[PDB]
Amino acid sequence: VVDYRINEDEFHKISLLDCDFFIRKPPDPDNDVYDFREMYVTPPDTDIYSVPRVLAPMPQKYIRCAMSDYGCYDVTEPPIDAPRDPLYKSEREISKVFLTKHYRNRRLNDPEFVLDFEEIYVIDSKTKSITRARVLVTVPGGRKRDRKDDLLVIRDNGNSFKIIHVGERDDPTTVIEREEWTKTREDMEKHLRKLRDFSVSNWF
Amino acid sequence: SIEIWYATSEYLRQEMNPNFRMTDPFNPVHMMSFSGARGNASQVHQLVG
Amino acid sequence: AEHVRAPYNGKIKFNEDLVHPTRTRHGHPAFLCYIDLSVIIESEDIIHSVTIPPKSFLLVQNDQYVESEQVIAEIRERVRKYI
Amino acid sequence: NGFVVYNGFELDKKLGRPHPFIDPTKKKQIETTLTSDESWWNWRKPEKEQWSRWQRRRPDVETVFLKAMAETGQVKLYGKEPTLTETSLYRARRHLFKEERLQAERERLAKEGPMAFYSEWVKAWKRDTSREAVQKH
Numbered sequence A: 001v002v003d004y005r006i007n008e009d010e011f012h013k014i015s016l017l018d019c020d021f022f023i024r025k026p027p028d029p030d031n032d033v034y035d036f037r038e039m040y041v042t043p044p045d046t047d048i049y050s051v052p053r054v055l056a057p058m059p060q061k062y063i064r065c066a067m068s069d070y071g072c073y074d075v076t077e078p079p080i081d082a083p084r085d086p087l088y089k090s091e092r093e094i095s096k097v098f099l100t101k102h103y104r105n106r107r108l109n110d111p112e113f114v115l116d117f118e119e120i121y122v123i124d125s126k127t128k129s130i131t132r133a134r135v136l137v138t139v140p141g142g143r144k145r146d147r148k149d150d151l152l153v154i155r156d157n158g159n160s161f162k163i164i165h166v167g168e169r170d171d172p173t174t175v176i177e178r179e180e181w182t183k184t185r186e187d188m189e190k191h192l193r194k195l196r197d198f199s200v201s202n203w204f
Numbered sequence B: 001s002i003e004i005w006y007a008t009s010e011y012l013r014q015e016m017n018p019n020f021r022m023t024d025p026f027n028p029v030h031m032m033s034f035s036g037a038r039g040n041a042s043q044v045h046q047l048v049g
Numbered sequence C: 001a002e003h004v005r006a007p008y009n010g011k012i013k014f015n016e017d018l019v020h021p022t023r024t025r026h027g028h029p030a031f032l033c034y035i036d037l038s039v040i041i042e043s044e045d046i047i048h049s050v051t052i053p054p055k056s057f058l059l060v061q062n063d064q065y066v067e068s069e070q071v072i073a074e075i076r077e078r079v080r081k082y083i
Numbered sequence D: 001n002g003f004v005v006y007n008g009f010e011l012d013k014k015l016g017r018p019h020p021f022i023d024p025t026k027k028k029q030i031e032t033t034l035t036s037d038e039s040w041w042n043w044r045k046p047e048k049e050q051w052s053r054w055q056r057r058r059p060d061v062e063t064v065f066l067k068a069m070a071e072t073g074q075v076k077l078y079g080k081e082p083t084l085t086e087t088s089l090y091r092a093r094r095h096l097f098k099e100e101r102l103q104a105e106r107e108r109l110a111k112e113g114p115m116a117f118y119s120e121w122v123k124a125w126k127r128d129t130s131r132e133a134v135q136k137h
Helices: A172-192 B002-023 B028-034 B041-048 D061-072 D084-112 D114-121 D131-136
Strands: A011-015 A020-024 A033-042 A063-076 A089-102 A115-124 A129-132 A135-137 A150-155 A160-165 C003-005 C010-013 C020-023 C029-033 C037-043 C047-052 C056-058 C071-075 D004-006
Touching: A063 A115, A115 A135, A115 A160, A172 B002, A172 D084, B002 B028, B002 B041, B002 C003, B002 D084, B028 B041, C047 C071, D061 D084, D084 D114, D114 D131
Parallel strands: A135 A160, A135 D004
Antiparallel strands: A011 A020, A020 A033, A033 A063, A063 A089, A089 A115, A115 A129, A150 A160, C003 C071, C010 C037, C020 C029, C029 C056, C037 C047, C056 C071
């Protein structure tokens, strides 16, 4: 907790479900430049600033980054009190924000712009903290490779970060079917385990 | 005699629905009662339990 | 009155000195449980544990073989009968 | 830093191929239990087998179909007679196997041709029904 009210005109206000995250913003026409030296976390819509918890080394030089939120949708059916009350209410519950550095701080308008997936910082609303992503790379090339051909996969509630070739992209149908097959297989094994000939039975 | 056969009867009714839900979800008897259309679990138990 | 049933085939493993012998309303020997007794079923694959709540009748013995869905424990007017 | 890093059973179970529910290697016996001399009267195995009226397994469609697909090799069971667990699993998943059989029949029709395929139900047809023979005719 700090004892002063910062000026939000020079900060990146990142709003999440449980808090509002502030990162000092160096002036830039693109407004994609971030200064991680000064940071603050506040409860949503509150000017009581506090230093956020840091779980990893933070950059010291200005880096251009691309912001993308992570969360779910809250489609609820609110009770109908007044005439013409809405039948449903949909709101975006953002729980994580990923900051991905541009390759060599290249601008978006640059014809050679690519994203550097090895440099991702994760902002967590529940813990009011900021961390660096544990990125695992499988594309051949190592440090020196063509960044135009890599694809990032984020799983496990924004905790698993993996870099794969764009050619081995997985269909959304395949992902959904994999999850369904795994869960239903475990459920079926749990249901059948209570039968007394289960130990002398086969799966098929 | 009364309580052992009441416990056996009550256990069949409890496991009647998970058996329908996991192994025969589109069984006509299950759909006729799970949907709330006609018949309850007690009446189905009289037929299959 | 709810019945605890064996969830797997296996060997019942528990200490009989933490339970008090009794006689059920059906005339069977049993063990009365007044504590948080832990019962171990040594199944075919993995050793499993079943928790028996207190104030309950334990109808099985130590080292007894049980089958799945078999009742192993039970938790919990004047009529004239003629012989 | 250290944030970027560059780099039978247990496969049939993963793939969903027919396999035992319990791994035979990771399986143990149930030791020795009460021998009716250290057991109460109500937990003793009767000296003589008792007639039950439930001593025979109930016949159904699932057992017959599972035995047929075990004969054809579509699935393999733990033993010769499918268990009740296997019967329940087949009841759950029985549409996929029928779809596979129908697809195999469709492929056979596409490969052999209508004359060879439909001659199964025309026994009075003694001529050769192969595609080559049809071309010659």
